[PDB]
């Protein structure tokens, strides 16, 4: 029931399977082991989540599953399929955000001006 | 049963051999067709949890997958070599405006 | 979307130029004012 | 799409700072005249 949580920031990507929060869980990518294989130390797993960098759209974006110790990947029926066009140091902001930042700029400059004017009597 | 996600040029689709049950997320437009769901445009950031069972030969086994697309066409590339300059010059501008208005009385 | 980008960079150059001219006017204004006061 | 949007944001911010600077300069010129 508890959906997976995905946080994409810059190029690093963090992937969590919150089904089992009281223990460690390995990870899979179309039943092929990834991360911490004595090589490519950039791509590695965590205690409870995933941590991947230099994300590619062509490769490494498929089906992911979180599985307990000694459990076949087909045991859990809650899979993972995500797509992402990772954009380094590059986030998404919608028009209300820029409107609010402009309004904040106006409010702060006007408040400062009014404060100095009133202070001068 | 791994549910396959097919993909056309500008249409995103989810196909499985039984009724797909919505629990959370976005469907786009309501679809009366059974055993198939249409999500929406590629650039729509479709988020959702979709659940459908197994097939006739694969009866009595559920299959739920989460689908997310991060293909953003409203995202902004953030360059630290410009925002710092613009914020520092705005700070200088407001400082010196305060100086000027203070000089008024 | 190419036309939007072209117009955008044209406007950016316009406004950088206008900032430069406003800066030079501020320079002469403040020189004269600090001389008088 | 990513580069264009920052270009628009930067040009908007620079236009705002231009308006602020012109207000400053008007204020200074008015003060020196008084």
């Amino acid at each position: 029931q508890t959906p997976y949580k995905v946080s994409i920031s810059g190029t690093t990507v963090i992937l969590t399977c919150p089904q089992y929060p009281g223990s460690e869980i390995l990870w899979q990518h179309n039943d092929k082991n990834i991360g911490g294989d004595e090589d490519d130390k950039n791509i590695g797993s965590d205690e409870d989540h995933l941590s991947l960098k230099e994300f590619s759209e062509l490769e490494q974006s498929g089906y992911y599953v979180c599985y307990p110790r000694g459990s076949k990947p087909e045991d859990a029926n809650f899979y993972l399929y995500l797509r992402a066009r990772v954009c380094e140091n590059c986030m998404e902001m919608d028009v209300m955000s820029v409107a609010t930042i402009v309004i904040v700029d106006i409010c702060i400059t006007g408040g400062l001006l009014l404060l100095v004017y009133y202070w001068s009597k | 049963f791994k549910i396959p996600i097919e993909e056309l040029e500008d249409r995103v689709f989810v196909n499985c051999n039984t009724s797909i049950t919505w629990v959370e997320g976005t469907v786009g437009t309501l679809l009366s067709d059974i055993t198939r769901l249409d999500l929406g445009k590629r650039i729509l950031d479709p988020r959702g949890i979709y659940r459908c069972n197994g097939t006739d030969i694969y009866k009595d086994k559920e299959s739920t997958v989460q689908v997310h697309y991060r293909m953003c066409q409203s995202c902004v590339e953030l360059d630290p070599a410009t925002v710092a300059g613009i914020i520092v010059t705005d700070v200088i501008a407001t400082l010196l405006l305060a100086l000027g208005v203070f000089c008024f009385a | 979307t190419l036309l939007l980008q072209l117009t955008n960079t044209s406007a950016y150059y316009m406004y950088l130029l206008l900032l430069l001219k406003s800066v030079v006017y501020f320079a002469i204004i403040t020189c004269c004012l600090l001389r008088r006061t | 799409t990513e580069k264009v949007n920052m270009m628009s944001l930067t040009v908007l911010g620079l236009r705002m700072l231009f308006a602020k600077t012109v207000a400053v300069n008007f204020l200074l010129t008015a003060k020196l005249f008084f």
């Binding site: 028009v95 820029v98 | 066409q73 409203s74 | 979307t1 | 799409t1 628009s8 908007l12 705002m16 308006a19």
Partner: peptide, 26 residues
């Protein structure tokens, strides 16, 4: 992207307020 709406009505909105306040005061 955001296109004109983020840049058109934003500053034109505040400067229009500047004109209105100016007219009333004068």
């Amino acid at each position: 992207g955001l296109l004109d709406p983020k840049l058109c009505y934003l500053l034109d909105g505040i400067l229009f307020i500047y004109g209105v306040i100016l007219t009333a005061l004068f």
